[PDB]
Design a protein around this motif. Structure first.
Motif, PDB file in Angstrom:
ATOM      1  N   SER B 465       0.835  -1.189   0.000  1.00 15.92           N
ATOM      2  CA  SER B 465       0.000   0.000   0.000  1.00 15.92           C
ATOM      3  C   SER B 465       0.877   1.249   0.000  1.00 15.92           C
ATOM      4  O   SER B 465       1.633   1.480   0.942  1.00 15.92           O
ATOM      5  CB  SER B 465      -0.947  -0.023   1.173  1.00 15.92           C
ATOM      6  OG  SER B 465      -1.844   1.074   1.128  1.00 15.92           O
ATOM      7  N   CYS B 484      -0.921  -3.854   4.368  1.00 13.26           N
ATOM      8  CA  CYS B 484      -1.899  -3.756   3.296  1.00 13.26           C
ATOM      9  C   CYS B 484      -3.068  -2.891   3.755  1.00 13.26           C
ATOM     10  O   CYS B 484      -3.743  -3.230   4.727  1.00 13.26           O
ATOM     11  CB  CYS B 484      -2.411  -5.131   2.883  1.00 13.26           C
ATOM     12  SG  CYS B 484      -1.226  -6.090   1.905  1.00 13.26           S
ATOM     13  N   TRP B 485      -3.289  -1.772   3.053  1.00 10.96           N
ATOM     14  CA  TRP B 485      -4.420  -0.911   3.363  1.00 10.96           C
ATOM     15  C   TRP B 485      -4.956  -0.214   2.116  1.00 10.96           C
ATOM     16  O   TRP B 485      -4.194   0.278   1.288  1.00 10.96           O
ATOM     17  CB  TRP B 485      -4.077   0.082   4.482  1.00 10.96           C
ATOM     18  CG  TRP B 485      -3.099   1.157   4.113  1.00 10.96           C
ATOM     19  CD1 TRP B 485      -3.385   2.355   3.526  1.00 10.96           C
ATOM     20  CD2 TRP B 485      -1.680   1.161   4.354  1.00 10.96           C
ATOM     21  NE1 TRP B 485      -2.244   3.091   3.357  1.00 10.96           N
ATOM     22  CE2 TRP B 485      -1.182   2.389   3.861  1.00 10.96           C
ATOM     23  CE3 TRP B 485      -0.778   0.247   4.916  1.00 10.96           C
ATOM     24  CZ2 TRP B 485       0.174   2.720   3.919  1.00 10.96           C
ATOM     25  CZ3 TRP B 485       0.560   0.578   4.981  1.00 10.96           C
ATOM     26  CH2 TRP B 485       1.027   1.798   4.486  1.00 10.96           C
ATOM     27  N   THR B 486      -6.290  -0.175   2.015  1.00  5.20           N
ATOM     28  CA  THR B 486      -6.980   0.733   1.110  1.00  5.20           C
ATOM     29  C   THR B 486      -7.004   2.121   1.750  1.00  5.20           C
ATOM     30  O   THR B 486      -6.554   2.291   2.883  1.00  5.20           O
ATOM     31  CB  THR B 486      -8.373   0.209   0.732  1.00  5.20           C
ATOM     32  OG1 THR B 486      -9.133   0.056   1.929  1.00  5.20           O
ATOM     33  CG2 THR B 486      -8.335  -1.096  -0.034  1.00  5.20           C
ATOM     34  N   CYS B 487      -7.519   3.111   1.011  1.00  2.57           N
ATOM     35  CA  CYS B 487      -7.431   4.496   1.440  1.00  2.57           C
ATOM     36  C   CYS B 487      -8.761   5.214   1.230  1.00  2.57           C
ATOM     37  O   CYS B 487      -9.424   5.017   0.212  1.00  2.57           O
ATOM     38  CB  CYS B 487      -6.303   5.217   0.711  1.00  2.57           C
ATOM     39  SG  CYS B 487      -4.658   4.579   1.124  1.00  2.57           S
TER      40      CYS B 487
END
Ligand SMILES: CC(C)CCC[C@@H](C)[C@H]1CC[C@H]2[C@@H]3CC=C4C[C@@H](OC(=O)CCC(=O)O)CC[C@]4(C)[C@H]3CC[C@]12C
Ligand SMILES: CC(C)CCC[C@@H](C)[C@H]1CC[C@H]2[C@@H]3CC=C4C[C@@H](OC(=O)CCC(=O)O)CC[C@]4(C)[C@H]3CC[C@]12C
Ligand SMILES: *[C@@H]1O[C@H](CO)[C@@H](O)[C@H](O)[C@H]1NC(C)=O
Ligand SMILES: *[C@@H]1O[C@H](CO)[C@@H](O)[C@H](O)[C@H]1NC(C)=O
Ligand SMILES: N[C@@H](Cn1oc(=O)[nH]c1=O)C(=O)O
Ligand SMILES: N[C@@H](Cn1oc(=O)[nH]c1=O)C(=O)O
Lengths: 764, 764
Positions: B465, B484-487
């Protein structure tokens, strides 16, 4: 020097039994074994000896064959049992045909690494670890117990079924604990059951280390209630000892594996702390004939067991001075009337021990029947026993043991087995006992829940984060685990899209009650009904009544000079414009239809255009002092506005648009732009100011019962009202109703101060 | 049957060398070893033999003592080397004094479990695994290499320094790989470096399994670029073989441990795929004297090495038919002029081998010097060598080996060592080589970064990410890992409180640019300046000018009858009220001060009260048709309003409140409530309507130059304006300016249509 139990015979079958405890720290280098045990020790030894006696005294299994044995103390330690296995393979440089391999898995692995070099097949009875299924590494390993993969599955089933989610995990250092914990961990990760912090510890570990472990378990106390102690006996024992040493008695639940299966000695004198504890035992029935044999044993008689004297010393803390073990350490000489039946606890797993020895015998039986069927005894083919041939026999061997169940081996040397579940609860006045609760079999977990706790309010379920989804409040990951979360409420705009994410609705939409998703807002229409709407309605009603009143009067009194003198046609144009102006009210208060939105702008443009155009012509007639061209002038001034309206329709059609003052409210209006409002209004206003000028200039003509005077008064009030209702339409959000009031009041003023006085005079 | 190298002498030192490869699958049960190797095999064997020769031919170390040896082929497999170690301990039932223990850690552990029973101390040279530091389990293990705890630290340092965060992790099945991977994993978890998915594989594993592993690595390809291959040689070899078999040549980076250290044979014919690969080798210098000895070796001469013939066969694929190994499998008889110097690659780790044998010799030297100093040779104390005494010597032994560095052992039998880092890059036209890049030492990682890649645009950094914090956009955890990350972007209300959480500002506050936290909004004051404000200012200015104008005129013309006749005092009260009404404008447009907020309400109440009270008295005087009691009546009607104002001040003080139309705009106003507005306004309005009634009733008195007529006209317009400015104050958000316009225009109308006509007449 070491101590060896042995029975003579033709074929010798070795075995490793944990007679003593493991050596403690700072003794492991001398390799001096701890205190004796029966249930893992002497009981199993006597089991083997009597089973071998039975197989000797049975003409069915292996006729004309006297089976012998060698029992070695495993001492539960890896190196000790390894040395004993060296003492086995000393002959291979009577040869041992195969072993009944040691209890613990780690010790089993250590022994088999040696054995498979010398082609000596090992049958376990307790070494349940799943990494022993790898027949590539372990060719000669057949356990009569299931793999602990199933056991980890049973534990994960339990922690699912009782909704434990945020658990602590202690496992014994060693291959059994480590592999079993790994299996439990990955299964729990799959099935969405988190683990606080995996700890590990030796069994012979220091009290300091146990206290450190217990404090580390304390560091998760309010949430992580249940400990998934995939441990062994002395591990659990040391844990309970630490619990009393910190006085944290009824603090938290633990959940034990078959190291803790049914054992009293691991709870003996520490009973108060293992309370409510849940355990998994391998399902084995009691062995009645063994009971009958074992309880009739006497230390003066059992010469053949060289541990039996020392055990008899230990169990009763007494001395047999006249016998080869004085044990001067003790006092209080043994009563001759002592019995074993006093507090006799039958070992759980020793059924498997009998089954294992049976399996060895049945394997040899199949081998005998195969290679030399027509010669009862040792033929030339079985002078040296081929280990691989024995393995081939054993992998295909089937029978029914003392349990009566079918004993078969799969491709992994792993015989199928069941599981029983006990709770360690109270019975009465501090008489504590394990009691069977439920069973696990091939996924089938049946269990008496109400039996556990004796109370429908259980232990605090090991949950890190309460289900804060109250229809409103979402999950916030701080990044610890998938079971620990803080919570944030979604806004009124925001529907709970998911546990993790909360997307808001858009304009034209609004979230539901439970915040699943969007809806449609009950939009407002404001037709017939509601005070303010109907207010203009009654206004327009009174206006239309006055319209018809004055209209009928001026139709009838056409013959009268006072009416006849002024431009009757232009007055009619005024009246028609005024009536259309009143119709504008009902045109504005409507359902938002396209034709309606058309006619609104049509009226607002044209009807004041009509009124002020006919009025400006009247002011011109009254000011300049053509007679049939005044109509033409009015026609021109009306058609200009009509052209403007049609051109604006060409530019933009006034369509039906959803209104957005804010999110909570949505209207459905006509999409009349600022230009589309102002421009026809601008033309109207310019005409208003024009006729204002031409009337104010000539306000001093008292003709026709002060016609111009009343008209000038009307124009004063008219212009004031038009200038007053300028900022209100722009400032308000109720723009339609304002427009209604404005134009209706304008027409009202025009009628009331032009034609109403004339009617009052003509009827006065 | 097995093959044994041995040199005769007084004291025998065993050793385990991986001469052959491990057996493949479906050969592990026969235990038939694979193809030969030199760099792990023959090179090390010759190293031991020549080192033993040197120690024999040195009068310094152990005089009058002929050291002997036994070399056993470890075959790199656990069971094979275990069998060899059994063949060692056969004598303990010439006795071996100690071993130079096998390469791999797992095999080392398996051997030592046997050895520590017979008190035979083991010195490793490659078994770097950290679990071998536990001297409780492993009393007789002293490696001359550092633990791989430091190596895992070096790897975590590298993956930090090159910002790799989302990595894949393959480790060799076996204790070395497993323990090293565990160390790397927990260190990475601490230092915030995630791992995609930990995989494990045997070295002798199937090509199918390698392909499965490679596809599983492919399943993370775009993000997880670098593989943290804490592996061994043949593991990496099999991985590269799988890479070519899938044709995924320059696909992704891998990062190898000292299994992959400097070895060509693991890249031989697969060079194109290990490109850009980063490796860690233990820092060992070249051994020149060994080079000189080793390169002069001939197969016709080296009788004492029973593997040397077979190796000579293998290296040149040729045959020595006249020599005891024909090897009919091959063809193309050996050229007699063949040399080893052609493509001679010196082994890395064999420096440690020489150091280990030196350590054994120096330990024996210290033991000799301790127990029998005054007798050069084998005294009575060293007829049987005490293993524990040898261990005590060895733990305290120090020297300098062929490397010249100090060789000391800590409390864990772990000699300190350095680490070198190589990159496997191209040199020229497909001539690939490892080249030294950087060094790791006790945390100190120095490294030539620009040397790596030969390009400042490196490999794609293994990041799941991207740092989406652009001052605006936060981190959203889906619950996979902490990497791991969405935003999600924060709203305009919402300042980035943290990476994980984004709290909004409150009213009275607003977020900054980079969304660190809240600020204070530049609130609006609207004093002198701005169009609309100053508009009322000029209005009030013109009003005050007219005020003074008419005031001076009516002061001077007091003598005139037309002024004298009407109530001059009441007119003065009107004028004073009007002037105060104009002062209300400047009182309203002000900085929000408390005294100002007071005087606003004071004026708004009292000044119209004054005006309409004096006017109602005037209308009473003009209507009813006391002369000095009219003042008293006006005083009463003014004091009522004054009492109302004071009582409302008693009820609520008009304090200074921040206004909130919305979030983006904040004003600072007086907190005048709806009641506080309406009630004095209500009293004023009631007086307005009262005087309206009393004036409209008596509008038909033409006295005093149509005084009542102009007053009635004024009252008409006055009431219309007051009724017009009703909804505007409620509808607007600019309420102060509306109040300004309203009351100022009211006073304007009153003056302009009461007193201005009288002035116009008196000056016309
Ligand atoms: C009893 C009152 C105070 C409350 C309820 C009011 C409405 C139910 C009534 C009263 C007067 C009615 C109006 C009287 C005049 C006519 C004009 C006439 O032609 C139209 O303008 C057609 C438009 C339409 O269909 O409404 C018939 C409908 C309309 C608007 C009527 C529709 C229904 C109205 C608004
Ligand atoms: C040139 C103009 C069109 C633009 C700039 C306007 C202001 C800078 C001036 C013009 C008229 C002035 C006012 C004229 C009348 C007086 C009354 C007098 O007494 C007060 O009301 C005291 C209050 C105060 O201090 O403002 C002196 C200030 C004040 C408000 C003046 C303050 C400054 C004003 C608003
Ligand atoms: C908790 O367990 C009980 C009975 O097993 C039951 O209510 C349900 O399965 C669990 N509750 C939740 C919220 O999953
Ligand atoms: C990435 O590495 C380089 C050099 O080591 C440097 O910019 C910095 O340390 C790293 N970047 C970030 C964002 O941490
Ligand atoms: N299940 C065990 C052995 N075991 O250890 C104990 O303490 N009890 C017991 O049964 C293993 O597979 O190693
Ligand atoms: N580092 C190793 C041994 N090793 O395995 C290889 O393939 N190379 C190599 O050095 C271990 O500690 O076991």
């Amino acid at each position: 020097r070491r101590v060896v139990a042995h029975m003579p015979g033709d074929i010798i079958i070795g075995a490793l039994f944990s007679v003593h405890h493991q050596p403690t720290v700072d003794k492991v280098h001398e390799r001096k074994c701890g205190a004796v045990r029966e249930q893992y020790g002497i009981q199993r030894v006597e089991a083997m000896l009597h089973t071998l006696e039975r197989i000797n005294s049975d003409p069915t299994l292996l006729p004309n064959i006297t089976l012998g044995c060698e029992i070695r103390d495993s001492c539960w330690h890896s190196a000790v049992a390894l040395e004993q296995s060296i003492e086995f393979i000393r002959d291979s440089l009577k040869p041992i045909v195969g072993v009944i391999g040691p209890g613990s898995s780690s010790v089993a692995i250590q022994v088999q690494n040696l054995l498979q070099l010398f082609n000596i097949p090992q049958i376990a009875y307790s070494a349940t670890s799943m990494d022993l299924s790898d027949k590539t590494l372990f060719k000669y390993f057949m356990r009569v117990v299931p793999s602990d993969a199933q056991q980890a599955r049973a534990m994960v089933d339990i922690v699912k079924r009782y909704n434990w989610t945020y658990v602590s995990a202690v496992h014994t250092e060693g291959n059994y604990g480590e592999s079993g914990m790994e299996a439990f961990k990955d299964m729990s990760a799959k099935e969405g059951i988190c683990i606080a912090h995996s700890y590990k510890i030796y069994s012979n570990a220091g009290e300091q280390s146990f206290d450190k472990l217990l404090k580390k378990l304390t560091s998760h106390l309010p949430k992580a209630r249940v400990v998934a102690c995939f441990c062994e006996g002395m591990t659990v024992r040391g844990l309970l000892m630490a619990m009393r040493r910190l006085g944290l008695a009824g603090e938290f639940l633990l959940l034990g594996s078959d190291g803790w299966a049914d054992r009293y000695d691991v709870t003996d004198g520490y009973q108060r702390e293992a309370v409510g504890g849940i355990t998994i035992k391998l399902q084995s029935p009691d062995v009645k004939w063994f009971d009958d044999y074992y309880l009739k044993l006497r230390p003066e008689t059992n010469l053949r067991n060289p541990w039996f004297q020392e055990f008899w010393q230990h169990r009763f803390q007494c001395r047999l001075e006249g016998f080869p073990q004085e044990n001067s350490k003790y006092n209080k000489t043994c009563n001759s009337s002592l019995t074993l039946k006093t507090h006799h606890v039958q070992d759980s797993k020793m059924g498997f021990v009998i089954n294992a020895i049976y399996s060895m015998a049945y394997g040899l039986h199949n081998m005998q029947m195969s290679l030399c069927p027509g010669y009862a005894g040792l033929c030339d083919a079985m002078k040296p026993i081929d280990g691989r041939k024995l393995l081939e026999s054993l992998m295909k061997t089937a029978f029914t043991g003392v349990s009566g169940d079918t004993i078969l081996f799969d491709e992994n040397g792993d015989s199928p087995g069941r599981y029983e579940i006990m709770n360690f609860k109270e019975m009465g006045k501090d008489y504590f006992d394990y009691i069977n609760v439920g069973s696990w079999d091939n996924g089938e977990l049946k269990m008496d829940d109400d039996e556990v706790w004796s109370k429908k309010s259980n232990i605090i379920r090991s949950v890190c984060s309460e289900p804060c989804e109250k229809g409103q409040i979402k999950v916030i990951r701080k990044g610890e685990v998938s079971c620990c979360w803080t919570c944030t409420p979604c806004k009124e705009n925001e529907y709970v899209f998911d546990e993790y994410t909360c997307k808001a609705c858009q304009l034209g939409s609004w979230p539901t009650d439970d915040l699943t998703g969007c809806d449609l807002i009950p939009v407002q229409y404001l037709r017939w009904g509601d005070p303010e709407p109907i207010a203009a309605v009654v206004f327009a009603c009174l206006g239309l009544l006055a319209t018809l009143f004055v209209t009928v009067v001026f139709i009838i009194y056409r013959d009268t000079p006072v009416v006849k003198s002024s431009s009757r046609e232009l007055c009619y144009i005024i009246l028609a414009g005024i009536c259309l102006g009143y119709l504008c009210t009902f045109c504005l208060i409507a359902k938002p239809k396209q034709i309606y939105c058309y006619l609104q702008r049509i009226g607002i443009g044209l009807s004041p255009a009509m009124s002020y155009s006919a009025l400006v012509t009247k002011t011109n007639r009254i000011a300049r002092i053509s007679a049939c061209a005044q109509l033409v002038i009015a026609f021109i001034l009306i058609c200009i506005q009509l052209g403007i309206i049609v051109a604006l329709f060409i530019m933009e059609p006034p369509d039906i648009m959803h209104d957005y003052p804010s999110i909570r409210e949505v209207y459905l209006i006509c999409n009349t732009t600022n230009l589309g409002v102002v421009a026809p209004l601008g033309y109207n206003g310019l005409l208003i100011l024009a006729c204002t000028f031409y009337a104010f200039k000539t306000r001093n003509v008292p003709a026709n019962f002060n016609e111009a005077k009343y008209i000038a008064f009307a124009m004063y009030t008219t212009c004031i009202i038009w200038l007053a209702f300028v900022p209100i339409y722009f400032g308000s959000n109720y723009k339609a109703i304002t427009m209604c009031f404005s134009v209706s009041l304008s027409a009202t003023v025009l009628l009331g101060c032009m034609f109403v006085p004339k009617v009052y005079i003509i009827l006065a």
